[PDB]
């Protein structure tokens, strides 16, 4: 059928996790320890380097700020570029908790539901899945190629300043071969260095899609038992317990990650809105600030409805096997749905390192915070 | 008696349904399939694509703004024809989920109430029901006879601006009979567009009306059969079912709809009270600002209002049926009171979107943004 | 005993309440009807329609106000009389509930506690309630006595201005005797318009201390029952029902009451401090503003104390009866108090019309409110 | 085995609490009632009188204050040393709540856990225990450090102003050996006020500390009952009703001790703020005042997060002993499961006073508080 087609594609963010440079660990589909080859350890540690030092001239880069406008200008790029350490810091630390993240979506076969309504479900699995991939993706290529390869190739069609915010360097960077093996090596550099944090928001995603599908499932498991004992009921409830553990694990690692990802993205919002609504920019980095924006905004959005859907369908889940059947049924079905139904009403939140919940009024509370700084960085011109 | 009454009403919302262009599904009493005829089917399509081509001129009226004052006046116009568009396109798309509301509203007698609370329960429906269709009413035609044809009767009692804001038009319009062309079709095209999101508010309001008097019907029927086996607790159970299936039917349309409201109706807001309280209006416009803030102010006052009322009425169905006839009933009356306590501590809330609570305490923190957000239009000058 | 004491004080908060003008109901201690006498009709009706003459000339004071700063004199006094006048029109509707709230803290005899806690229940209740009692009896008289005889006794040792803030009038008031006769009916009008939300304010903080009492007698209750079937738990849930009954008829008129109180209060309060901050004042009206500060602060204080001892007394009595006895009793028992937790996680709160729920968190949230405003009446000077 | 250890802290730590001066109640390891003599009774009331003379002089020092440059100078040093105070009244009341307390983390074991659980949960404790203490005790030597014996320093090696901010004194102190032996004085006060709030919320971090432990070894002895009837589950209910018997006994004093010290602390740190971003610093206090920030920050960050840990690991608790062995248990596990369930959804948290639950989330409520009073306090100048 299709289910060999889904498999497929955790094929496929797996191998895109070893090209970004995260630290390679075991898929589903090896069975001869390839993870531990020496090849791909040394290129993750390169790419992890390569990565920390550009990350550390960019962030001494903005403590070298004369004026307001220099540090302003560094915000942006430090931010994306301290978000992707972090990322990258903590994806190496756990490493062996996304074994079981990727054990979980390759089986997670419901018992109970009918079939009719799981080929609709990993149909729109797989829907949705192809949608936010390729949407990041196609943003986040567009966002790089023109924020690095436009005033490069400005200057190769005809006081130059190449890339758009200036770093520190052991040379002087303002002579003309400097400058152009500079701006090649900060093009490869943000390549590596843009694609770890989409590629981490990807899985995320994927995670999220499968847990609402799994959630889905099991409360039409719950109303196809009720409609008919023992046993339907003790997997029921050992599915639901999956799911609570798998969202334990999915917490950690990305309350860190989504902790720093949400305030410097906010930090990065408000300067991108100063430079666009205030000062005279010079026509060439606005395809870039325009873009970079609405990648932002993008990942903000799609991470925190995919963060909201699982509450609701756990709470929807606190809904069901409610019927007359309820009230007709045994004292051992009137306590076990009792105790789901208990347990449920605990909701399933990813807490961005217990500071605030990931959810959607969340996005509404943070973009008054935007226009809350929006309107000071105006005034202080 | 007077339920045959009801019906009545119910028949004329969905007349005015079809008056002001929605898309014409099957009322319940219509069994020769007349709202799939032809005559209903162009004159929605041509209320609609007239409704488009006006909001998409005074969309891009608002983009040619060359001074703050003339975007401020364009906002109030633009934001309620916009929410208009997202009430046009909403009720286009879930044509099928009003069928089964209004086949709600039709029939919903309660198993187990006494007589003698169902006939006050329908007295004040009615009552509640005339009050909140008349109110919006009378105050959006007045609201619109004056903002359309005070100037226009003005100046045909008496450089001449007929119109409150202007628009991008292929003409000039500034040039006599032109003017007066387009004020007439301005006339008629704000008929037709004002009268949508009221008919769309006085459905949902209907809706919550209905919806509350069934939660107490509801509570007095758990009440009267705790007080004398299985059939009335199924039948009870059997209706909350419905009643929360309905809210959640209720749930998307509205949400997506509340979010547009309340966002553009506060911008409404700020705009009038800055152009109320700074500028120097020249007296003919006065009618129509006053009148458009009370009935912005009523509508969100009483969206909120019949919003609140159902979750008070559903964690009042909480505390049902507890008495000492509890403690002095079976082991499945014991069980099952418990079992519809704990699916009652869940809210029965509508959320716009998934952003916000529509309660009664959202409608202070946005007047309190609206408070925050006027200031500082004062200050801007 | 000393429970003869306590009739007493609800005797004298019921005499109290017949000084200040409300609407005269039946207390307990009344078998022959005195309350329809037409003494006390005339009174009440007097001062209540020389209560609404004198707030209606400070209201339209209020709006012929020229400059900012005679319009934020008047907001103060404004503030209180019109809190005042729906005080008054909110106990004329409800004289029917009082009645059942007088029946409650007459005879409230818990069934099951040890006399103990019962004698020490009743010694801390008489000792709150005088507390509380005098507390605002002696600072409202204090500030009343300061505010209008403070510069009359000024005049009377020694243009004038014996009044604080002016109100429209038929004649001048600028005339010599005119103002001092204005002055004195400003006397007694004060008494009559200060003594009633005192009064109501008085009552509520009763009723919150004996359902305090109330709530500690009945996890007493719990905890002595579970020590040791039937009686005994019917009789405890009957309490608990009694209680939240008489909680649901406390919440409609302090609902509006308090809302109109907060409002008021929290613009009351700005004006204040932007007054004694900014202006010169003359030194005699000190006196009155820094006693009207602290009575308000008092006031809001005392009431959100006595609103959140009553919630945290209903999360207590979800914690009754839990130990190893509990694990050792018998299914009847297990079911019961698993019924009682299962109400008890319900809060008890009191709404101010369904705005904000009286905490001592809001509080803060309208402390910080004040200072907010407060900043920007000082900028605006 | 390593157990001895633990008590040895919980030694140490009552010997830094009466090294500060708080009043000496019974430690665990006293047999003679050594905690009478009166040694310690006037060595404790001698430190607390020399601390309340201190606050006095410091508090009346704001007081007469002419600029409000002074007035913020002395807001740090006026905020702690009230901090101090209120810790020292709060506990001279509750000398008795103390002797719960520290019997409380002197004998707590569990009935149920594993063994190879317990080694580690005991590793844990004392890991964290020490960090927590070594951290606080060596930020606080070192800024007690530079804040007071740097400007001394420099002038024993070098119109002096040795100390920071002036207080109210009955002599000049401008005179050069008033000012020496003032400084002299201010040290030895310093030392005597900043080791109480520390010793105080070490013994918090501690009680946090072993509550979590205490709550994680209770999951883990559910999860070893169920998996195996009457004698564990009596025992594991006594153990979750000792720990909320201790959490409630925790609240009070830290209530109050929480209210002072957080409105305080934001007061403060909005000054220190405002005068190292603003004013031309000397270069000598700067070192007092960068650690007086990384001190604050520390304390509330390390507050708040063991106040967190302890709700997250109750709610943790809800959902202990789910499995199908659940579903395949009798009637008496499967209510008394429930019932632990039900008890173990109300979450375990400390209030300060009742105004805020202390959160993790108020800690970026109240970032965001100090964000906005520092550009206020920035642009006043
Ligand atoms: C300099 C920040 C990296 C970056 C630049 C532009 C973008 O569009 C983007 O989104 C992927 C990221
Ligand atoms: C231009 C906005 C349409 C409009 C104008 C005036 C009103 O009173 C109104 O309420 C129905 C709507
Ligand atoms: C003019 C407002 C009435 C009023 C004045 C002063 C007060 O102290 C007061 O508290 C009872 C009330
Ligand atoms: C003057 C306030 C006392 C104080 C000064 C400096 C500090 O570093 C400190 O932390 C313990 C306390």
Redesign the interface.
Known sequence: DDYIHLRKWIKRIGIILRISGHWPFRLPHEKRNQHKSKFRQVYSCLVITLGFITCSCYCIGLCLSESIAQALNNITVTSYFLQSCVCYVSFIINSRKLETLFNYLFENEVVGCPRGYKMSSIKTTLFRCKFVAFSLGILSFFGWLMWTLLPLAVLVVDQTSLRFVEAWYPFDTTTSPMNEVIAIYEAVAMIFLITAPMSSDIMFCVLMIFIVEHLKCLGMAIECTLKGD?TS???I??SH?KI?RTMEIVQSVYSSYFATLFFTSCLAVCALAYFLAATSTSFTRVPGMVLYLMYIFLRIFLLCLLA?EVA?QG?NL??AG???K???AS??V??????I???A??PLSITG????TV???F??SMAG?MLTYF??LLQVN
């Open positions: 023992a009921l003790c997997n409830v050992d317990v609570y909201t609701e709470l606190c809904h409610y019927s007359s309820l009230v007709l004292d051992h009137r306590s076990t749905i009792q105790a139904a208990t347990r009403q605990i390192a217990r500071f605030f959810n959607l009024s996005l509404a915070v309107i000071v």
